[PDB]
C-alpha cells in the first residue's frame, strides 16, 4: 500500500515535469529497456541479428525519408508451385475470432501431457464460456464454479 | 506427371534466363543515366 | 485519422522455428526504425514474435502492406498487440533518479 | 487623449487555428488542390515501371562534383533543415523551413517553391523570387549564392 | 452536448421539418458560442463561422478591465437559415482542444 | 448485354479492312457451330493438371 501511494506521487510529479517543460519550452514518448521488460509477459528474448542490421534500423529513420526517395518496385513471374495453419483443433473447441487468437494462442499448439502451466492451459474453458453453443456455456460455467 | 515435372523445370530455366538477361539491362540503364548526370554536372561547371 | 486500439507493438505469428532475425530486421525494417523485437524461445511461444517501432504510423503502414504477407510457405499473422494484461511482473519504480535529474539539469 | 481605450480589438488570425490546421511544429506551404503523386499519374498514363515517368534525384557536393544517395520524387516533399522536415538537409544555412517541391497538375509536372528562406535558393545558379510555383524541367540544378551542395533532376529513361 | 441528442431524437422519430425546434424562434439571428478558447478573437471566429452564412456583427464578451475574452461570443448573421444551419451543424466542435457550444 | 454483343459483332464486321470488296475475287466466310459434347467429354485427370497451371 505505501508503495501504491508512492506510485501516485511519482505519477503526478512526472505530470508536473512534462507539463512544466512545454511551458519552459503522449503515448508515443520513447521507452526504456526496463519499461520494455515491463510490457511483454514471461519467456521472450531480445535479439540483435547483426550489429549491422541494427545500424540499418538506426539509419532506417533517416532512410525512411532517404530510401523511400529511391529506386524500388516489386514484380512477379509465372511459375508452377506446405501451407501450415492452425484453427483450434482438439475434438471440437468452438471457434476463435481472428483477434481472440492473441489471448487463446496457448491453446492452439497441440503439445500435451508434459503443473501451473497445465492449470492455465485447462483454464481455457473460459473460451468455452465466451464463444460456443449455449450448452457448452452452461456446463463450462458449472465446471469452473466447482473448480 | 513426367510432362509436368520436365515442363516446370524447363519454364524455370527459361525464367532464370529472362532474369539474367534483365539484370544486365538494368545496370546498363543505371550506368547510362549516371553518365548523363555526370555530363550534366560538367556542363554545369563550365 | 487512426483507430485508437492500434499500438506501436505488433504481435506476429506463423513463423518458422529456423527463421533468422536477419530476415526479420530486413523485411520489417521497411516501414520505420525498429524500437526492438522479441521472439519466443520457449516451448509454447516458439514461432511467435513481437515487433516495436519508434512510431505507430510505421506499424500502421506495416500491417497495411504486411497484412497476410508471405514468408517461406507461410502467411504471417499480423495483429496489433494489446496493452496492460500481464505487466506488473515489473514495477513502477526508479522514477526518483531520472526525475531528480530533469529537476537538476534543466532545474525545472 | 493619447489612448482612449487600452484594449480595442484585433480581427486577426489565431495561433491555434493555423497551428492545429497544419502540424507535423506548425508548418507552412499546405499543398494546393492539384497535388497528386507521380506514380498514379503514370497509372492514368497506362505506364508500367519500364515506361513510367519517375523523377530521380542526383546529388553533387557543391565543392566536389556524386551520389551520397539517389532520391525518387514519386512516392510533394518538404525540403528543410535537420524533427519536422521530411527532406532533411545537413546544410547549416537552410532555415528550419527552407523550401518545398510539389508535383502539381496543369499533366503531372514537377514544381519547386521557395518558402522564403532567409538566404534564398539558386536555380541553375540563378535565383528565383519567393512565393510562386516555378516549374522544373529535367537536368535543371538546385543548390541563393555560393551553398554546400548541388542537386539535379532526371526522368527515368534508357 | 445535450443538443446533439435532441437532434437524434428529432431525426430518429421522423420529425419532418417545420415542427423542428429551430422553428421555436424564427425571430432571431444572434447565436451563442460558449466554451470558446481564450486566444480566439473577432476576425478568427468570423472566419470560421462565415462558412455557413455571412455574419453581420458579433459582440464577443471580453472582460472590460483586463481586456481578454470571458470565453464566449454572441454573434449575428445576415440570414436565419444560417443560424439554423450553424446551431444544428457547427456544434460539438473541437477548437484548440476544447469543444465549443452553440445555441440560439 | 448479349444484343449489344450482336451490335459489336456487326459493326465489327463492317469496320474490317476492305471487307466487302469482291474486286479481286475475295471471299468471306461466316461459320457458326457448337462443340457438341464438351462438358460431358472433359477429363477429370486432365482437368486437374490444367487447373494446377492456374490456381
Description:
Chain D: There is a cross-link at residue 39 (Glycyl lysine isopeptide (Lys-Gly) (interchain with G-Cter in SUMO2)). Chain D: The modification Phosphoserine is found at residue 157. Chain D: It is found in: Nucleus. Chain D: Residues 77-128 form the FHA domain. Chain D: Residues 144-158 are annotated as: Disordered. Chain F: It comes from Homo sapiens (Human). The structure is cut from a larger assembly and holds chains A (147 residues), B (46 residues), C (108 residues), D (158 residues), E (104 residues) and F (55 residues). In chain A, 52% of the residues lie in helices and 1% in strands. With 147 residues, chain A is mostly helical. With 108 residues, chain C is α+β, with helices and mostly antiparallel strands. Chain C has a single domain (3-82), classed as Alpha-Beta Plaits, CATH 3.30.70. In chain C, 27% of the residues lie in helices and 22% in strands. In chain C, the strands form 2 sheets. Chain C has a 4-stranded antiparallel beta sheet with strand order 2-3-1-6, with helices on one face. Chain C has a two-stranded antiparallel ribbon with strand order 4-5. Chain C is globular and about 55 Å long. Chain C starts with 8 loop residues before the first strand and ends with a helix. Chain D is mainly beta and 158 residues long. In chain D, 9% of the residues lie in helices and 30% in strands. Chain D has 2 helices and 11 strands, in the order H-H-E-E-E-E-E-E-E-E-E-E-E. The longest helix of chain D has 7 residues, at 15-21. Chain F is an all-alpha fold and 55 residues long. Chain F is built from 2 helices and no strands. Chain F starts with a helix and ends with a helix. Chains in contact: A-B, A-C, A-D, B-D, D-E. At the B-D interface, helix 1 of B face strand 1 and strand 11 of D. Strand 1 of chain A pairs antiparallel with strand 2 of chain C.
Amino acid at each position: 500500500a505505501e508503495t501504491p501511494r508512492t506510485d501516485r506521487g511519482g505519477d503526478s510529479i512526472g505530470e508536473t515535469p512534462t507539463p512544466g517543460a512545454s511551458k519552459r519550452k503522449e503515448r508515443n514518448r520513447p521507452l526504456s529497456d526496463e519499461e520494455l521488460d515491463a510490457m511483454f509477459p514471461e519467456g521472450y528474448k531480445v535479439l540483435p541479428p547483426p550489429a549491422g542490421y541494427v545500424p540499418i534500423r538506426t539509419p532506417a529513420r533517416k532512410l525512411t525519408a532517404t530510401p523511400t526517395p529511391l529506386g524500388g518496385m516489386t514484380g512477379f513471374h509465372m511459375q508452377t508451385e506446405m501451407k501450415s495453419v492452425n484453427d483450434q483443433p482438439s475434438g471440437n473447441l468452438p471457434f476463435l475470432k481472428p483477434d481472440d487468437i492473441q489471448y487463446f494462442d496457448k491453446l492452439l499448439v497441440d503439445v500435451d501431457e508434459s503443473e501451473e502451466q497445465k492449470e492455465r492451459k485447462i483454464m481455457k474453458l473460459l473460451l468455452k464460456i465466451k464463444n460456443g453453443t449455449p450448452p457448452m456455456r452452461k456446463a463450462a460455467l458449472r465446471q469452473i464454479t466447482d473448480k | 506427371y513426367i510432362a509436368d515435372r520436365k515442363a516446370r523445370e524447363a519454364v524455370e530455366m527459361r525464367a532464370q534466363v529472362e532474369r539474367k538477361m534483365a539484370q544486365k539491362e538494368k545496370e546498363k540503364h543505371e550506368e547510362k543515366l549516371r553518365e548523363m548526370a555526370q555530363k550534366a554536372r560538367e556542363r554545369r561547371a563550365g | 485519422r487512426l483507430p485508437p486500439e492500434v499500438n506501436r507493438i505488433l504481435y506476429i505469428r506463423n513463423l518458422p522455428y529456423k527463421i533468422t532475425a536477419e530476415e526479420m530486421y530486413d523485411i520489417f525494417g521497411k516501414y520505420g526504425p525498429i524500437r526492438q523485437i522479441r521472439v519466443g524461445n520457449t516451448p509454447e511461444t516458439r514461432g511467435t514474435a513481437y515487433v516495436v517501432y519508434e512510431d505507430i504510423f510505421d506499424a500502421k503502414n506495416a500491417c497495411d502492406h504486411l497484412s497476410g504477407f508471405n514468408v517461406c510457405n507461410r502467411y504471417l499473422v499480423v495483429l496489433y498487440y494489446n496493452a496492460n494484461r500481464a505487466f506488473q511482473k515489473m514495477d513502477t519504480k526508479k522514477k526518483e533518479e531520472q526525475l531528480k535529474l530533469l529537476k537538476e539539469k534543466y532545474g525545472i | 487623449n493619447l489612448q482612449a481605450q487600452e484594449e480595442e480589438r484585433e480581427f486577426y488570425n489565431a495561433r491555434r487555428r493555423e497551428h492545429r490546421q497544419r502540424n507535423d511544429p506548425g508548418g507552412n506551404n499546405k499543398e494546393k488542390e492539384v497535388p497528386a503523386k507521380e506514380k498514379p499519374s503514370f497509372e492514368l498514363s497506362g505506364a508500367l515501371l519500364e515506361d513510367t515517368n519517375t523523377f530521380r534525384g542526383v546529388v553533387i557536393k557543391y565543392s566536389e562534383p556524386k551520389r551520397w544517395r539517389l532520391y525518387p520524387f514519386k512516392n510533394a516533399y518538404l525540403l528543410g533543415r535537420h524533427p519536422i522536415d521530411h527532406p532533411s538537409c545537413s546544410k547549416q544555412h537552410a532555415v528550419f523551413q527552407y523550401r518545398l517541391v510539389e508535383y502539381t497538375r496543369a499533366r503531372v509536372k514537377p514544381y519547386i517553391i521557395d518558402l522564403g528562406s532567409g538566404n534564398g535558393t539558386f536555380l541553375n545558379n540563378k535565383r528565383i523570387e519567393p512565393q510562386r510555383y516555378y516549374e522544373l524541367k529535367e537536368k535543371d540544378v538546385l543548390k541563393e549564392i555560393d551553398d554546400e551542395d548541388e542537386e539535379e533532376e532526371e526522368e527515368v529513361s534508357d | 452536448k445535450l443538443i446533439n441528442e435532441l437532434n437524434e431524437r428529432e431525426v430518429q422519430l421522423g420529425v419532418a421539418d417545420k415542427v423542428s425546434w429551430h422553428s421555436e424562434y424564427k425571430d432571431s439571428a444572434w447565436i451563442f458560442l460558449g466554451g470558446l478558447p481564450y486566444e480566439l478573437t473577432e476576425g478568427d471566429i468570423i472566419c470560421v463561422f462565415s462558412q455557413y452564412g455571412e455574419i453581420v456583427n458579433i459582440n464577443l464578451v471580453r472582460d472590460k478591465k483586463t481586456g481578454k475574452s470571458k470565453g464566449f461570443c454572441f454573434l449575428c448573421y445576415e440570414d436565419q437559415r444560417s443560424t439554423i444551419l450553424a446551431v444544428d451543424n457547427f456544434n460539438g466542435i473541437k477548437i484548440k482542444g476544447r469543444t465549443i457550444r452553440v445555441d440560439h | 448485354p448479349p444484343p449489344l454483343l450482336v451490335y459489336k459483332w456487326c459493326q465489327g464486321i463492317n469496320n474490317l479492312q476492305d471487307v466487302w470488296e469482291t474486286s479481286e475475287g475475295e471471299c468471306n466466310v461466316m461459320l457458326e457451330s457448337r462443340f457438341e459434347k464438351m462438358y460431358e467429354k472433359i477429363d477429370l485427370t486432365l482437368l486437374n493438371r490444367l487447373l494446377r497451371l492456374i490456381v
